[PDB]
Scaffold this active site. Structure first.
Site, PDB file in Angstrom:
ATOM      1  N   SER A  94       0.792  -1.274   0.087  1.00  0.00           N
ATOM      2  CA  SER A  94       0.073  -0.004  -0.039  1.00  0.00           C
ATOM      3  C   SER A  94       0.807   1.275   0.202  1.00  0.00           C
ATOM      4  CB  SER A  94      -1.066  -0.022   1.189  1.00  0.00           C
ATOM      5  OG  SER A  94      -1.887  -0.998   1.012  1.00  0.00           O
ATOM      6  N   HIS A 130      15.062  21.082  16.854  1.00  0.00           N
ATOM      7  CA  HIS A 130      14.309  19.851  17.369  1.00  0.00           C
ATOM      8  C   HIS A 130      14.157  18.852  16.004  1.00  0.00           C
ATOM      9  CE1 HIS A 130      11.600  16.829  18.914  1.00  0.00           C
ATOM     10  NE2 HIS A 130      10.828  17.070  18.069  1.00  0.00           N
ATOM     11  N   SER A 132      13.008  14.829  15.266  1.00  0.00           N
ATOM     12  CA  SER A 132      12.434  13.476  15.739  1.00  0.00           C
ATOM     13  C   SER A 132      11.754  12.839  14.620  1.00  0.00           C
ATOM     14  CB  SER A 132      11.650  13.895  16.829  1.00  0.00           C
ATOM     15  OG  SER A 132      10.267  14.456  16.464  1.00  0.00           O
ATOM     16  N   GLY A 134       8.898  11.167  14.724  1.00  0.00           N
ATOM     17  CA  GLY A 134       7.644  11.154  15.079  1.00  0.00           C
ATOM     18  C   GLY A 134       6.956   9.538  15.038  1.00  0.00           C
ATOM     19  N   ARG A 135       7.949   8.760  15.486  1.00  0.00           N
ATOM     20  CA  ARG A 135       7.515   7.225  15.777  1.00  0.00           C
ATOM     21  C   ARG A 135       7.445   6.952  17.082  1.00  0.00           C
ATOM     22  NH1 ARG A 135       6.143   4.222  10.910  1.00  0.00           N
ATOM     23  NH2 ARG A 135       6.828   5.586   9.139  1.00  0.00           N
ATOM     24  N   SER A 140      11.580   4.849  17.394  1.00  0.00           N
ATOM     25  CA  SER A 140      11.618   6.231  17.763  1.00  0.00           C
ATOM     26  C   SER A 140      12.939   6.979  17.766  1.00  0.00           C
ATOM     27  CB  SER A 140      10.805   6.642  19.221  1.00  0.00           C
ATOM     28  OG  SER A 140      10.731   7.869  19.326  1.00  0.00           O
ATOM     29  N   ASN A 144      18.012  16.656  20.174  1.00  0.00           N
ATOM     30  CA  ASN A 144      17.695  18.348  20.407  1.00  0.00           C
ATOM     31  C   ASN A 144      19.204  18.945  20.390  1.00  0.00           C
ATOM     32  OD1 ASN A 144      14.652  18.651  20.518  1.00  0.00           O
ATOM     33  ND2 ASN A 144      15.111  17.638  22.809  1.00  0.00           N
ATOM     34  N   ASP A 172      16.514   7.884  23.201  1.00  0.00           N
ATOM     35  CA  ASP A 172      15.783   7.337  21.760  1.00  0.00           C
ATOM     36  C   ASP A 172      17.070   6.709  20.993  1.00  0.00           C
ATOM     37  OD1 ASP A 172      13.091   7.541  22.247  1.00  0.00           O
ATOM     38  OD2 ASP A 172      12.918   9.454  21.403  1.00  0.00           O
TER      39      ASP A 172
END
Ligand SMILES: CCCCCCCCO[C@@H]1O[C@H](CO)[C@@H](O)[C@H](O)[C@H]1O
Ligand SMILES: CCCCCCCCO[C@@H]1O[C@H](CO)[C@@H](O)[C@H](O)[C@H]1O
Ligand SMILES: CCCCCCCCO[C@@H]1O[C@H](CO)[C@@H](O)[C@H](O)[C@H]1O
Ligand SMILES: CCCCCCCCO[C@@H]1O[C@H](CO)[C@@H](O)[C@H](O)[C@H]1O
Ligand SMILES: CCCCCCCCO[C@@H]1O[C@H](CO)[C@@H](O)[C@H](O)[C@H]1O
Length: 257
Positions: A94, A130, A132, A134-135, A140, A144, A172
């Site tokens: 998909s 910042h 990231s 977003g996981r 994740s 920073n 992370d």
């Protein structure tokens, strides 16, 4: 106009409030990586059917929040940079997105005119960054940084150094500085309308790092043909400690300068 001067560009007021300012480059290229990090994205249900060919894009905008905050030629700005890797061709799964790196910044920039023996320091920007993906755990990634971005030109050359200091939570990815280093060097050369560019980071202590070579030429007054070749660690947050060589071709709006 001053080629590639981000801060000076932000000071130039736009009549239409919806006409934004470019920060980094804006492009959309069809790529092919040498090795795909399935080990890190193993938690995903489509992980095994991951194709080495992906649609990669970068969106980058700057928003002048307050002009003249620290005297003339200064600005309190913000920027948003997003890099996304998309398994578009992967119709079987998909067409999922493998990774997206949201990178907003808040800075204080100055448009300068310092002479460096032929060179001219045009931009001096200092701020917070910042970054990231977003996981949700375990995929994740986040960190920073407090940084400084310096941009100087000399005829057909452009050099930009961006040293930083990591601040905050790095749970992370505790060793992200091992592969990313403490700065980012960017170089651009103008051969007529053709623009050659280099962008990389390197940790002189560990020997880890990555680089990016690019070449563009105008298709029209606004769009350009862009060819990119990344090689090394840190292409994306999920691949910060993964090595790969990526080649891609596509369209680009603005380049370095
Ligand atoms: C245009 C598609 O948008 C993308 O959709 C992805 C999947 O939801 C998100 O992870 C990305 O952030 C977004 O750019
Ligand atoms: C620019 C607006 O965006 C914000 O910028 C901040 C900069 O410090 C980031 O820390 C936030 O995550 C981001 O939402
Ligand atoms: C040089 C001007 C920098 C302007 C950027 C504003 C950054 C405000 O942002 C704050 O920075 C702090 C730094 O210690 C962090 O601890 C906070 O989490 C962050 O929200
Ligand atoms: C204006 C020119 C600024 C150049 C920025 C280079 C800063 C990167 O310098 C790094 O600093 C670290 C901390 O002291 C050291 O541990 C690393 O060995 C060193 O490479
Ligand atoms: C890397 C680009 O290098 C430049 O290429 C120009 C074109 O050949 C030469 O005229 C310049 O001397 C050289 O610095």
């Amino acid at each position: 106009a001053v080629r590639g001067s981000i801060i000076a560009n932000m000071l130039q007021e736009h009549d239409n409030p919806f006409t934004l300012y470019p920060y980094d480059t804006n492009y959309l290229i069809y790529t092919q990586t040498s090795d795909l990090n399935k080990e890190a994205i193993a938690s995903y249900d489509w992980a095994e059917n991951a194709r080495k060919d992906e649609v990669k894009f970068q969106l980058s905008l700057a928003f002048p929040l307050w002009r003249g905050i620290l005297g003339p030629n200064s600005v309190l700005g913000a920027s948003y940079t997003q890099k996304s890797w998309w398994q578009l061709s992967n119709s079987e799964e998909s067409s999922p997105f493998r990774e997206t790196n949201y990178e907003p910044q808040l800075f204080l920039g100055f448009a300068t005119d310092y002479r460096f023996a032929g060179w001219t320091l045009r931009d001096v920007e200092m701020g917070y960054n910042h970054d990231s993906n977003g996981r949700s755990d375990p995929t994740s990634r986040s960190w920073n940084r407090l940084y400084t971005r310096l941009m100087a030109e000399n005829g057909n050359w452009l050099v930009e150094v961006k040293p930083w200091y990591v601040v905050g939570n790095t749970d992370d990815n505790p060793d992200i500085t091992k592969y990313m280093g403490y700065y980012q060097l960017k170089i651009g050369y103008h051969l007529g309308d053709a623009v050659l560019s280099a962008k990389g980071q390197y940790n002189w202590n560990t020997g880890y790092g990555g680089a990016e070579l690019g070449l563009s030429y105008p298709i029209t007054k606004h769009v350009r043909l862009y060819t990119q070749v990344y090689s090394g660690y840190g292409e994306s947050l999920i691949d910060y400690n993964f090595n790969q060589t990526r080649v891609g071709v596509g369209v680009m709006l603005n380049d370095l300068f």
